[PDB]
């Protein structure tokens, strides 16, 4: 299926002409991002072996999401660039949809941590058996929405045989699918920032009350500092017509800024008890 990818990469502008052989390479940034993947797989593997003893499953689910995100982007670099024209479009949907299920479950799990710290606070509703029925239905819905949204192009919703709907970052994806992903990502983002402000507004109750919780809800909002410049660029992609906005060609720098969020999540969420500080005493 090489000529199908050739026509879409000629429509987008990443392949210049029907005679030129492709040569998308740097050999600097494509070894840099591997060491970024080599740190995300190394950080998140250490989180999973360190836990053995409710507690820690939400941190363990998130570090599992960031593990597979580090595995899939390391897979994605080795199958992109000059190698991406040896791939079938059915293989191409697997390479790109593997990053929408891992990063989709990573962002959905951050919402599940947001509902967990909100639930056990001021009001114990008897609507939910909160023992293990809540922790299983959250993580089940975090991975069900991620696979459903992430594998939604390969089941049909793509720009195959409809070139004006082709995105410039993802040359086979649908711009209407991206606008579905923009509108529900912001719906995840405005949900987290109103719950995290509600948790800060509901710890004001009856040494002192130093409240470190204002200082941590700002530092966990590096999530908007890591993820929103990609979704500006997705909003640029759906809005800009083809070959008119050339900031979309440096989009791989906006991808890693969403994937360095997977490196920060072992730092932001494992500051309790300081496990690593004892775990390498000798």
């Amino acid at each position: 299926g090489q000529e199908t990818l050739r026509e879409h990469y000629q429509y987008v502008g990443k392949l210049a002409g029907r005679l030129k052989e492709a040569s998308e390479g740097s050999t600097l940034t494509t070894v840099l991002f591997l060491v970024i993947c080599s740190f995300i797989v190394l950080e998140n593997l250490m989180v999973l072996i360190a836990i053995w003893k409710r507690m820690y499953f939400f941190i363990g689910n998130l570090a599992l999401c960031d593990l597979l995100a580090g595995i899939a982007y390391k897979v994605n670099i080795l199958m992109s660039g000059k190698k991406t024209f040896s791939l079938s479009p059915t293989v191409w949907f697997l390479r790109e949809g593997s990053m929408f299920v891992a990063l989709g479950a990573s962002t959905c799990s951050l919402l599940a941590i947001a509902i967990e710290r909100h639930l056990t606070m001021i009001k114990m509703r008897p609507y939910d058996a909160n023992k293990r029925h809540r922790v299983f239905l959250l993580i089940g819905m975090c991975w069900l929405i991620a696979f459903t949204l992430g594998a939604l192009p390969i089941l049909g919703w793509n720009c195959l045989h409809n070139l004006p709907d082709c995105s410039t970052i993802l040359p086979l994806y649908s711009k209407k699918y991206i606008a579905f992903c923009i509108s529900i990502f912001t719906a995840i983002l405005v949900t987290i920032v109103i719950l995290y402000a509600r948790i800060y507004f509901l710890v004001k109750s009856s040494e002192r009350s130093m409240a470190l919780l204002r200082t941590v809800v700002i530092v966990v909002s590096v999530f908007i500092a890591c993820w929103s410049p990609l979704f500006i660029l997705f909003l640029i992609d759906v809005a800009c017509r083809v070959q008119a906005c050339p900031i979309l060609f440096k989009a791989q720098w906006f991808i890693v800024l969403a994937v360095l969020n997977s490196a920060m999540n072992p730092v932001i969420y494992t500051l309790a008890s300081k496990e690593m500080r004892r775990a390498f005493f000798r």
Partner: antibody, heavy 119, light 108 residues
Framework: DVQLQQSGAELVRPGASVKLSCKAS????????MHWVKQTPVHGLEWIGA????????AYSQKFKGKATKTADKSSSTAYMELRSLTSEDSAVYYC????????????WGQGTLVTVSS | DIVMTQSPKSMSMSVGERVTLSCKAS??????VSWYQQKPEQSPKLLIY???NRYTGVPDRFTGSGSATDFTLTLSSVQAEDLADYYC?????????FGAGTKLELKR
């Protein structure tokens, strides 16, 4: 930014040869193809051929396989097209243009070299 | 190759009228058809690439349309600097083939 300076004004005897040039500036020359288009008042716009500047690989039309010959010198960022044994049919304006980003958008054209074939 | 048949050959216009130029293809070309404008002793200057994607500096009176075989280019108000020659070209397969021409002229 992107100009295609083109060596214009030629005048050639019949049976002689001519070598035209299209000089590129404002972009990396080895990343996009160079195309050459011929315009007569009778036959209209005619495609002569194209060339990939890095790795000197060409593709022609079958009408011009034998007239036109294309080279590319990446050290000077210019492209050459050589017409050979010209008749009166070969007197036209020859444009150079690029597929800028892709063959979808031929946005940047040259200026034309007028070739008059008299004797 | 791929023959593109462009009509009309010439049409005499007065300022402010609407015109629509047709360009049909012998084959499926997709949406790779462009539209160019040429003035005397000047390069062809690209107006519309793609289905209907206006190049930078092309006004709102230029409108493209088409898919696979039938392609149109319309002018909602012909202005005085739009009086030039116009072409369509296919760009879907090398060799590139263009139309024959459409000369917009002044009506008296």
């Amino acid at each position: 930014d992107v100009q295609l300076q083109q060596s214009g004004a030629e005048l050639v005897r019949p049976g002689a040869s001519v070598k035209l040039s299209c000089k590129a500036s404002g972009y990396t020359f080895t990343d996009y193809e160079m195309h050459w288009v011929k315009q007569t008042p009778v036959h209209g716009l005619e495609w002569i051929g194209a060339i990939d500047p890095e790795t000197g690989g060409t593709a022609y039309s079958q009408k011009f396989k034998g007239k036109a010959t294309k080279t590319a010198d990446k050290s000077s960022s210019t492209a050459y097209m050589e017409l050979r044994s010209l008749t009166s049919e070969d007197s036209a304006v020859y444009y150079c243009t690029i597929p800028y980003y892709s063959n979808l958008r031929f946005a940047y054209w040259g200026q034309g070299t007028l070739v008059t074939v008299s004797s | 190759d791929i023959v593109m048949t462009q009509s009309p050959k010439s049409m005499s216009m007065s300022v402010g009228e609407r015109v629509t130029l047709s360009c049909k293809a012998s084959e499926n070309v997709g949406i790779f058809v462009s539209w160019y404008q040429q003035k005397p002793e000047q390069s062809p200057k690209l107006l519309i690439y793609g289905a209907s994607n206006r190049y930078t500096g092309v006004p709102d009176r230029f409108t493209g349309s088409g898919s696979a075989t039938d392609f149109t280019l319309t002018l909602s108000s012909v202005q005085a600097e739009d009086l030039a020659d116009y072409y369509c070209g296919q760009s879907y397969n090398y060799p590139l083939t263009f139309g024959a021409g459409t000369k917009l002229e002044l009506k008296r």
